[PDB]
Amino acid sequence: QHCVAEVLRLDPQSGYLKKLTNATSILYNTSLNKVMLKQDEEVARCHICAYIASQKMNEKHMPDLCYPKKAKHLMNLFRQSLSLLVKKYCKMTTEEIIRLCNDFELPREVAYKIVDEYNINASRLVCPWQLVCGLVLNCTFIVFNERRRKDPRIDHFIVSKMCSLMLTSKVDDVIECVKLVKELIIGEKWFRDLQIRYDDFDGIRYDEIIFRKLGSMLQTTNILVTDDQYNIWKKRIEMDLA
Amino acid sequence: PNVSRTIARELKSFLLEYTDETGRSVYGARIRTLGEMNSESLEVNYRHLAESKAILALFLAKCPEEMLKIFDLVAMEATELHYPDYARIHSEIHVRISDFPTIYSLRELRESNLSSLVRVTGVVTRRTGVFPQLKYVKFNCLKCGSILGPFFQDSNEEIRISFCTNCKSKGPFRVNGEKTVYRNYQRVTLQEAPGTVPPGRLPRHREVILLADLVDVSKPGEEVEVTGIYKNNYDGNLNAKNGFPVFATIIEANSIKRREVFSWTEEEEREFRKISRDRGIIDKIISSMAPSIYGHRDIKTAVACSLFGGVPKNVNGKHSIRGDINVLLLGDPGTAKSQILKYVEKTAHRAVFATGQGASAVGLTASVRKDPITKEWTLEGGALVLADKGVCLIDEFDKMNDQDRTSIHEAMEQQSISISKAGIVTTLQARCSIIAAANPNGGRYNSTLPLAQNVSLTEPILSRFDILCVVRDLVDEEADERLATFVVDSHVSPIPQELLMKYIHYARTKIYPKLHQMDMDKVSRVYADLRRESISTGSFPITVRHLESILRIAESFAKMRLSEFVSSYDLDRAIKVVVDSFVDAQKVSVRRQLRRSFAIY
Amino acid sequence: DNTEIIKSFKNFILEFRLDSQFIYRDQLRNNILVKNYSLTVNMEHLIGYNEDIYKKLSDEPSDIIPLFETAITQVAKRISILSRAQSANSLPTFQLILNSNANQIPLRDLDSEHVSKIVRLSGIIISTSVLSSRATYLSIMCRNCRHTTSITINNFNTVSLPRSCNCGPDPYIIIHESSKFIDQQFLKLQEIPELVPVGEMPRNLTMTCDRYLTNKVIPGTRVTIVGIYSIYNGVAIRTPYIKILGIQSDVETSSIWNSVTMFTEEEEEEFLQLSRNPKLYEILTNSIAPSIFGNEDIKKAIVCLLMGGSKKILPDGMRLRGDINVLLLGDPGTAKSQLLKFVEKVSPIAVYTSGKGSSAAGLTASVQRDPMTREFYLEGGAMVLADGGVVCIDEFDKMRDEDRVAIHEAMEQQTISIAKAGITTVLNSRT
C-alpha cells in the first residue's frame, strides 16, 4: 500500500487519487487471481495499470501518463485478458528545456514561464539555445544572490557549468546571451513580480540603491564589516593556543 | 474474479458492525489494543464470519493466498482512522485466524486438500534461525551512482532488474543492504505425536515456515496447532529429475500456539506474607512437598531445607560462606529413590534433571562441542552450570569415572569450574545446590558398619554434605498396610505447588533475614559439649562443618517462615536435624549416644 | 544539510568541558604525541551538550560517522601545523572509538527490526581466528594505456574497479609495493550459559573490527559491546551480522601473566611507611586470616612463602628454587581448606585446583592438536598457567601416578618436559 501510494502519487512528477488507488488495487487483484497472467515482473507492475485506471473513472489524458517494449505487450495482453549557437534553426520541446532548467534544481514555475516565452515567441528565431540560455542564467542570478553575496566562488563554477553544458571554450558569447535577453525581457509584469520576490535590482537592494543614486553620502558601501562577523571571527583566535 | 468490490465492502462491513452478544464489537478492542501496542498482527475468529457466510470460505478456498489481498489493506484502513501515522510507522499488517474445525494428520494430506485451508497437529522441534529476508528493495547502480525505488517482493522469487530510469541499460546491479528493510523468516521442523502412531506404522515428518514477526514463540518439546495453507516448492535445479517429475510440499502457516513466565502480583505476595507469618507453615510444607509417595517426613524435611537456599556472605569479600544447601540420600533400591527428585525438577525454578551416561540430557560437565548446524562451536555446561543460582539433581551418583567425579568435587569445593583446553581458558559461577543418589553395595545398608566402610565412596566430597540420610528395609506389617494400599489405590491442607514455586520465586528475591547475637554463645556451649561427648563413646568426631551447616539451616528456616531474622526456638529444629543425622550414620556403638545427646533435643 | 551537523559536532570537540578542565582537546593533544590516530569517547557526554546529532546518529549512523572522521582529521590538520610552529605530509583518517552503559540487550530478544541501528549487549568470547587484511589505498596501472590512476576506500573493511578507462574490460593491474592496507579479524560471541533455556544449544554471532580496535581481547573475557546490526550475503535470504563501533572489556579477567609492573608513585610512600614499621610481620600475621583462629605458627609461614626467596643462578645452570614448598597435614575442621579457598583472592596471578586435575583441567600440560590443520599446540597447564605464582591444592591423596610424577619433579626443579612423538618441550613452571 506504501508502494501503491508511492507509484500512484508518482504521476504528478479530488476523486482521482482515491478512485485510482482503488482501481490499482482491484486491478492488481484481478490480474493475480486467475492463473492466466504470469511472468510479469513486479519491477514495473503499476503503470499501464495506472493508465487504464485513468481511462476508466471519467477523464483521461494521453500525455504525461505513460511517461517501453512490453508496455505495449502487457497493455494488449491485459486488455485481451479482461557548438550550440552556430547551429542554425534547431528545435526544442517542453521537456527538453525542462531538463536544461531542472539541471539547476530550479522550480518548475520559472521553467513554465520560459516555456510560455518560447511557445509564444519561438517564431522569429535564429537559435533558441541562446534565448533559453540567457533566460535560465537570469533566473539563476536573480534567485541565487544570497549564496553568491557571501560566496564569490560561485560565479566561476556556474558559468563554467553552462559553458560546457553547451560545449564551448569561448564564453563572451554567453555574456551576450545574458545581456541581450536582459535587453529583451526587461519590462514584463511577471519579470517584475520575480524582481520584487527575490530582490536583485542589478543584484542590490532597493532601500540601499535609492540612496546610492539619488545623491547621498549616507549610502552604505559596506567596506567595513558587520558586528556579528567579528562576534564570530573572535572564536577562531580564542583557541589560538592549540 | 473482479468481485473484490462486493467482497471488500461486505468484509469491511463485517469488520466494523460485527455484533454477537450485547451488541459487542469485539474487534474494536483488537485494533485499538494493536495501535496501543505498536503491534504488527491481528486475529479474526473464523467461526463467526463462517457462521454468517461460508462462500467467504469458498472464494478463500479456491485461492486463499489471493484471499489475503483485501484483508491486509483493510487492516490499515481501520487502523489509520483510529491511529493516524501508524501507516507511517508500521509499513504493513499481517493477520491470524482461530477456531477451524477440520483436522488432518501429518500423513493424511492428499492432493485434493492443498491450495486451501489446512490445519495440522504435531510438535515443534529443531528450531533454526530467526533469519532476516527482504520486503523493500533499493540499489547501488554503477553506470549511474544512484538507486531504485521501493518494491514489495512476492512469496516465491528473487528479483533482478535490467531497466534503468535514466536509460535501458542492464548495468551491474547490487542491493543496498546498508539501507534496505527486512522481515523475519524461520525454517522449522515438525513431527507427529508418538502417543498416537498406531500399531506398526511410523510417524511422518514435514517442514514449516514461520513469519510475521512471530518467530521464537516456540521451543523444543511443545504441542502445536498450525493452521495455514499448503503448496509445492519450485526451487530450481529441477530438470535433473530422474524417476517421475514429482515435487516436495511445504506449509505457509499463519496462526500458532503452544498448548496442544511465572511472576507475582500484589495480592499474590500479600497472601504469601499472610500465610508465612501465621503460625508455623512448615508442617504444612512437608505435608505438601511431594505426595508422590506417602513415604516419610524426615528426608522431605532435609530436602525442604535444600529447596529454598540460605544466604551467602563474605567478610568484606573474604571468608565466604555458602548460603545454598546440599543433600545426599542412600538406601536399598526397593523404595522410591528416583521419583521425588524428578518431581522437584517439575516443581522448581531453573531446575534440571541431568544424569550420568545413558538417558541423560548432558554429561554433567562443560566442553567444546560441535553443533549439527554449520559446525557452531559452543560451550555447554553441566546442569550444575545452569542453576548457579538454583539446584542440580542427580541419580546414581556412583556410576561415574575419574573426571566426572572431580568436576562435582570442584563444584562443592570452590563453587567454580575451570577449563584449560582448546584455546580457551575460563572460570564460571557454580554456586549450585547439589542433590544426588546412589545404590548401596548389596541392596541392604549393612547396618553393622559405618558409612564409608559400607559404601565405597570417598570422603573429601562426602564431607560437603550437611545431610547424609539413609533408610533400609522397612519390615513391619504397617509398612505393608500403608504402602500396598496406596500403590493399589494409585489404580483403583496441603497447598498448590504453583503457589509453592511462586513462594520460592518470591523468597530468593526479597528476604535475607538476619540473626541477632543475643544468646548465640550457646552455640559455643553445646558445640564444645558434644565435641567432647563424641570421644566419650564414639570413634569419629563431629566438626565445625556441621556447625556452619546448622547456621545455614537456621537461616534456611528463616527464609521458610519468611520471618525478619532468626528465631531461637527453631534452632532447636536445625540442630535436632543434624543430631539425628549423625545418629543413624554410625555403628550400633552409637546406641549410647541415643541416650546421651537427647538433652539437646 | 550536512555541514551544519559537522559544526554542531566539531564544537563538541574543543568547546566541551566538565569539572572545569578540557577533556577531549588535550586527549587528542596527547594521542598525537602517542602517534595513535584515534581517541576514546563517551556518548553520554553528548546528550546534554547537544540533541542535534543524537536522534539522527541513532537511526542513520553510517550516514553520519565518516563525517565525524573527517571532522576529526580537520581538527588534526590545524593542530599539527600549530604544534609544529610551537616545537619541532601523511595524516590519514582516525579511527573513532566510543562506548556506553545505557543498557544491555541480549541476543535472544533481537528480531529483524531495528536493523542497521545500534544496539547494546552482553556475552562471552571464543574466536581469535587470523589477521585478515583489507585495503585502504591501492594504485592502478593499465596494461595497455600504461595509464596510472588511484583508489582509496574508507569504512567497509559499494564499488569495484573501473570497467573501462582499445584496452577491453579488465585493463587494470593492482600494484602492491605502493599500496596500503589495514587489518581486521572475525570475532565471535555467545550468551551467558546461565541465562538460557533448559534445553537447547546456544546461538552465536560473528563481528568485525579494524586497526586499533583489534587484538584487544582473548577468549573467556566477558565483554560488552555496541555495534550495528549490518548484513551481507532458503528462498531468498541474507546473513545477519554486526559491525562493531564500541568494545569494553573487564580490565583484567582471568589472570594474565603479562600483568602490570610499573606501579604509581602515590603508593610508594605508604608502602615505605609500611617498610619502616617494626610491626610489619605481626600485622601481616594479624590480617592474613582475620576471621580465623589460632595456628599463628602456620600463618607465620605464608608470609615467608609468598615473597619467595633467593633466585640464585650459577654459571652451569643449576639454579636454586627461588620459592619454597609446603604441606599442611591434618583433620576436618582446623581451617585446612578455608585458607586455601582464600589464598587465590589475595593472590595476583596464581591458580587453584583439586586433585587428579579438575574438570577439563590438566594438572600438567595435557597437550593435543588443532581443530584446524591438525597441528600441534601446547594447550594448557595448571602448573604453567601460574608461572611465577603459587598453586593451591586439596585432596593430594588421590593422585594418578603419571599425574603425580611431573608435579613431584616441579617442587624440586619447577620445570616440566614433554617429548611426545613430534613435539619436544621444556616448559618452565617456576611455581
Ligand SMILES: Nc1ncnc2c1ncn2[C@@H]1O[C@H](COP(=O)(O)OP(=O)(O)O)[C@@H](O)[C@H]1O
Ligand atoms: N514407596 C513407593 N511407592 C510407590 N512406588 C515406589 C515406592 N518405592 C519405589 N517405588 C517404585 O520403584 C522404583 C524405585 O526406583 P529406584 O530405586 O529409584 O531406581 P534406581 O535405584 O535405579 O534409581 C521407583 O521408580 C518407584 O516407581
Ligand SMILES: Nc1ncnc2c1ncn2[C@@H]1O[C@H](COP(=O)(O)OP(=O)(O)O)[C@@H](O)[C@H]1O
Ligand atoms: N580453625 C577454624 N576456625 C574457625 N572456623 C573454621 C576453622 N576451620 C574450619 N572452620 C569453618 O568450618 C567450615 C568447614 O571448612 P573447613 O573445615 O576448612 O573444610 P574441611 O572441614 O573439609 O577441612 C568452614 O565454613 C570454616 O569457616
Ligand SMILES: [Zn+2]
Ligand atoms: Zn544506468
Ligand SMILES: [Zn+2]
Ligand atoms: Zn586502459
